[PDB]
């Protein structure tokens, strides 16, 4: 049967005070399997299920550094969207990203996902073709023009058709 992997990432700026709280949660077949929380005593990705303890320290170190980079990305882009929506600084805002893959019995990519939401509203989403973008409003059209010119869709497609499927199968084997 089919299988799926998804990551949901959120960053929340509270009252503009300090660093956004960043969280990332991964799911395989609708089961949470890893998780990162910036508010933890020492922020690292942690296994949420016993079959993930099969991965060595290098795996954890690596994906933790990916989380570290993502924190910065979310910081910068929260600021950018404050700009696009002409909102005053000092407020509370959330930026979310969901991405991942569905694969068939065949073990091949059935559908990829890469999509972003701001303050609980759709912002920009990669279409099923993994080539074109749905922009939810006029602000998101700015990003879409930039992303069409930068080949962002190809960038995400490289992960969705490569790493995403491979890792999903590795985790299905681990489980």
């Amino acid at each position: 049967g089919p299988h799926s992997m998804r990551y949901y990432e959120t960053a929340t700026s509270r009252r503009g005070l300090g660093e956004p709280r960043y969280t990332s949660v991964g799911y395989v077949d609708d089961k949470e399997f890893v998780r990162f929380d910036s508010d933890a005593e020492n922020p690292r990705y942690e296994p949420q299920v016993p079959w993930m303890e099969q991965e060595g320290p290098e795996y954890w170190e690596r994906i933790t550094q990916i989380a570290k980079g993502q924190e910065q990305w979310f910081r910068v882009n929260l600021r950018t969207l404050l700009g696009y929506y002409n909102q005053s600084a000092g407020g509370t805002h959330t930026l979310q990203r969901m991405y991942g893959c569905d694969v068939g019995s065949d073990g091949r990519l059935l559908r990829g996902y890469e999509q972003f939401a701001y303050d609980g509203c759709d912002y920009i989403a990669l279409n099923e073709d993994l080539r074109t973008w749905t922009a939810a409003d006029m602000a998101a059209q700015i990003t879409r023009r930039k992303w069409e010119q930068a080949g962002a869709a190809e960038y995400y497609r490289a992960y969705l058709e490569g790493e995403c499927v491979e890792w999903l199968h590795r985790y299905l084997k681990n489980g």
């Binding site: 990551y7 795996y59 990916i66 993502q70 962002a152 995400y156 992960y159």
Partner: peptide, 9 residues
């Protein structure tokens, strides 16, 4: 394994 968003809004 998670991925980078990379591209700026």
């Amino acid at each position: 394994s998670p991925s980078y968003a990379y591209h700026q809004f």
